[model samples]
Target: SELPQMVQQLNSPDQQELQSALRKLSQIASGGNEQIQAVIDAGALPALVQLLSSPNEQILQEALWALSNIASGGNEQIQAVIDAGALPALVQLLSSPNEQILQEALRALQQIAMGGNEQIQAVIDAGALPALVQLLSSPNEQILASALGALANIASGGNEQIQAVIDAGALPALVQLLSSPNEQILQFALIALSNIASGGNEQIQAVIDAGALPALVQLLSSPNEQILQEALWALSNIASGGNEQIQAVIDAGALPALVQLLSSPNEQILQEALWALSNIASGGNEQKQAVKEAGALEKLEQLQSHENEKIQKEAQEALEKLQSGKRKAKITWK
Candidate 1:
């Protein structure tokens, strides 16, 4: 009952009433999907989007919160927010001097970005990437994390989207975060970097040129399993870029650490280690020799008879590839 009245107050000339109404609507939107749709059905989206331009910081923040919650409802709700023309306003807010507003705006954009390619492309088209890349250098940890979260979602799109992030000067900052003291920051950075690398050779080379190898090698020994897992995935993707890229991983001193992980009690780590080593061994004799010198042969032999069938198969395949001696032609798909 009061929901409609509260939404009506959003357009009122009374400043205090507008603020009160936005606060109530934002709180109601937070209740759940049902309540979020109720507020949307109350014709609140356009008014909330309009309030984003309000000079009052409090009103802007509340409006962003309301839209952010609605975006979380799903793809259709996210599309609704986008269709309301909230994206450009949100992207513009990325430059706000106020950290609170910047954070809320990023949160809303990140949720919207979680939609499919069309929605992600919408956020990118609104010019969010450059501002987001710049925020990666923010001294505030929360701000850094939020920016990375948004970038990761954007990069999860196609090659063009990942290239957009790289073109925005995100690489150096993302590579730097690979060595950040905060584990969460490290995780987010790794995720964003991995997504970028998945775009193929040029993007992989960009990550390499940004100086990611040595830090990635260092992370192979991190106490946190998830970090180690993500690091391996990044390295494996890089190694798949072919010889020079594979040599870079090897030159970064990844072999010994990777060899050690062949014995990892964690199956995922062990498998990722195998994948990385296989990519390396897929190079010429020198690369194959390096893996053998790291003492992978005995471990590979042991894994050949391991209980997990996929692991057993991969380990056997890696062992055979390493011993083949003939330089296999690098396989390419059309």
Candidate 2:
């Protein structure tokens, strides 16, 4: 009874009544799926979306909050919010001079994007991409994080979506964020770059061209294990792009740090480092020589007999590959 009545008040002529109604709906939606379903069942979506165009900042913020919370539900709930036509209004709100409105709009878009590719494309079609890329430079930390989160989800849609992000000029700004003092920001930026680099050659080259390599190499030595792992993941993805890309990782002076990670106690870090090194060794003689000169041979030899069979196998393969390159050189000379 109260839910229906509160939803009814959404259309009340009185501004105060409308604000209160949206506030209640937002709080109810935040409670979880059952409560969100109740709010939706009461036909609050259209009215909430309508409030997104309200002249009153308070009403607009409340509406976005409610919609974002509802969108946080499963697929049906997210689609319901989108179907109610929240996207265009939300995208428009992204450019609002008011920080609170901008933040809420980003959160709303981010949640909706989590629905998957089609939904992400919808956000992109609503003209959110450029606005999102612009927000990446926001002095406000929260705004920056929200913007990155939205972009990351969009990039996950595959090559086309990633190319969209790259086309929007996200690589340069994302590369700049690799040096952010905030660990969360750094992590988000790395993950976004990793996703983008996972695209084709041009996309990976875009990340490398943005000057991400030096910063990425520096991160390999971070005391923070998560940062180290993320950096390794990003580097490994870049290395997989091909010979020139592998050499780019090497040119950035990543060998020493990567060779050091070969002995990391963290298996994930060790594996990522090994993967990057293997990609390098898989390159020409110069690349393999660089890996060997960095003193990775000793670590590779030690890992060949480690408790982890996967590591042992990978180590054996890398060693053989390295030695195979040498053997080929000797044969050519003979």
Candidate 3:
């Protein structure tokens, strides 16, 4: 509440007090919205950025906490943190010898994920995915959990990144994680699967025909909203993956489930659901009927007259396929 607070903490000779103050600052930062903008305005970025590693878990967490907050604030601030050499520290924390530090690093990475491509490349270039994948095979549950999220973000960077992990043998480990009842881990696995599916037909088919489809379909009831989002994103990614892949999702009962998400309050989720429905409806009569039978066509009908032109296009496209005689076509021209 006091303007002079951070400055006083900076000058404190007491190690515990300094660490405590930084920790409190970080907790505030997690939800501060724009409060941390004041710190950056006051030139506190260098010092906060400097605490990337202070041998104190709380301080390290705070530093990364601050970095991630800035990452979400926008491109200039994210670049500022990276220009301050914060990227390497983030990667190091991902592989930290301390489990608590590792958890903080994962949370920070998720926050960074929200900032999009720049931060994604920063983590990738810093060599995060392989280290995270290595943690996946180890016996530590907590680390396994963290690895999934870290790799998911890396995969979201682009198809090349997702392929990089697959080339390094990451998929099998991710598949093994799906068998666990842990929906949290399963959600991350779905995100990674979606990211990888975006690479090409082969990978998405490999994931599907390998029995990953039913597991994903089972996740339709996933209690976590974010996890469900990841699930829908994954299904849509698979649908965009081409004919065999879309059929796989359709066969596994993914269509109705995905369509169900369109009425959601989440705009991105609705968009993804629409995209998946459109892809599934790409074929002539049979595929169109399948999408229609799955209720996707009807669901999309609800979006057809909406304000957003993109949503309108997606909805109208699905509607046309159904009205155009519902005549099935093989659609395997590829």
Candidate 4:
């Protein structure tokens, strides 16, 4: 009749019992309401997040997967967990240390930041930004790739996020990743650039002003479909931010490279090109005519019938701006 039997099972040295505990923790990870409250009531998250420091591969993976579930829930449970200072422990896993654990840690951080500005600030305070950027230089492709994804997510948050990344001295390393032999690493760089650029104004200027434009253009031929796609997206975001980016890309001969992607067999690439075309085209008359002269308008028209909804949407948007026939003569930079 005693409940020590259940407690004995939890305390069991049996691997099966440990696995059951793992599964129960995983379930606890995904909850926002009663389930999460129950887990918190049962004292699961702290134990799990703390387990990130373990060297055991299976245990670390299980711990991170569980943490990912908690982070993904985006509930008061998350704030409570973060308030418990879980972020630094998470960021500590990011120190170019273990690739598998780092990926999950970064993923969890990304999710928690989706908890928005407050959680992002916690990430910042935990010193995740520098560690994240440092991974841009990681020798391991898997870790660098995941780190880049994390940076992109953080960058999308706001000016402060961008500033946090920038303050971490990310630009130089980001520039370096563009030339990485690893496609995954390259894709991460492109996405991060797009996120930062989309902040507009100072951020766009900040990246370009950091000497990122030329390297960005150089990445257009990055053999991977994903990198090429993100490059186009970044270029578009930069172009949308101002005419300076359009001119810079053009001067670096990126427009033609972007144009080449419009002919890509990959539907996503074609769509990315069209979105870039629209951003460049919609910069007002001067920039549009420049894009037009660069042969973008005609190419965009040809893509209007593209098979992918994503590509077609981008083409339609470009055509809309083209019809306006009013590209900017002189645009602001940052």
TM-scores for candidates 1 onward, in order: 0.83, 0.83, 0.72, 0.78
Q: Against the unseen true structure, what C-alpha lDDT does each candidate score?
A: 0.84, 0.83, 0.67, 0.68
**Model 4 error, position 119 (Å):** 1.8
List runs of model 3 lying over 4 Å from the truth.
Answer: 1-13, 27-33, 138-142, 199-206, 209-211, 218-230, 250-275, 284-286, 289-317, 323-334
- The per-residue C-alpha lDDT of model 4 at residue 333 equals 9
lDDT of 2 by residue, 24-51 (tens): 8888888979988999999998888888
lDDT tens per residue, model 4, 95-187 = 635566677777877767665666667788888887877677667777777677677777766677777888888877887777777766676
Ten-residue stretch with the least lDDT total in model 1? 325-334
Q: lDDT tens string, model 3, 76-135? A: 655666677776777777667788787767766655654456566776777777777788
Which model is ahead, 1 or 2, in terms of lDDT? 1
Query: In order, what is each prediction's RMSD in angstroms?
Result: 6.1, 8.3, 7.6, 6.4
Candidate 2 Cα deviation (angstroms), residue 256: 2.0
Candidate 4, pairs of clashing residues: 29-69, 284-326, 284-327, 284-328, 285-326, 285-327, 285-328, 286-327
Q: How far is candidate 3 from the true structure (C-alpha RMSD, Å)?
A: 7.6
Model 3: how far residue 130 lies from native, Å: 1.2
lDDT of 1 by residue, 44-99 (tens): 99898888999998878878877887888768888999999999999889989999
Q: Is candidate 1 or candidate 4 better by TM-score?
A: 1
Report the error of model 3 at residue 38, Å: 2.4
Minimal lDDT window, size 10, model 3: 325-334
Give the candidate order by descending lDDT.
Answer: 1, 2, 4, 3
RMSD of 2: 8.3
The collision pairs in model 3 are 285-327, 285-328, 285-329, 286-328
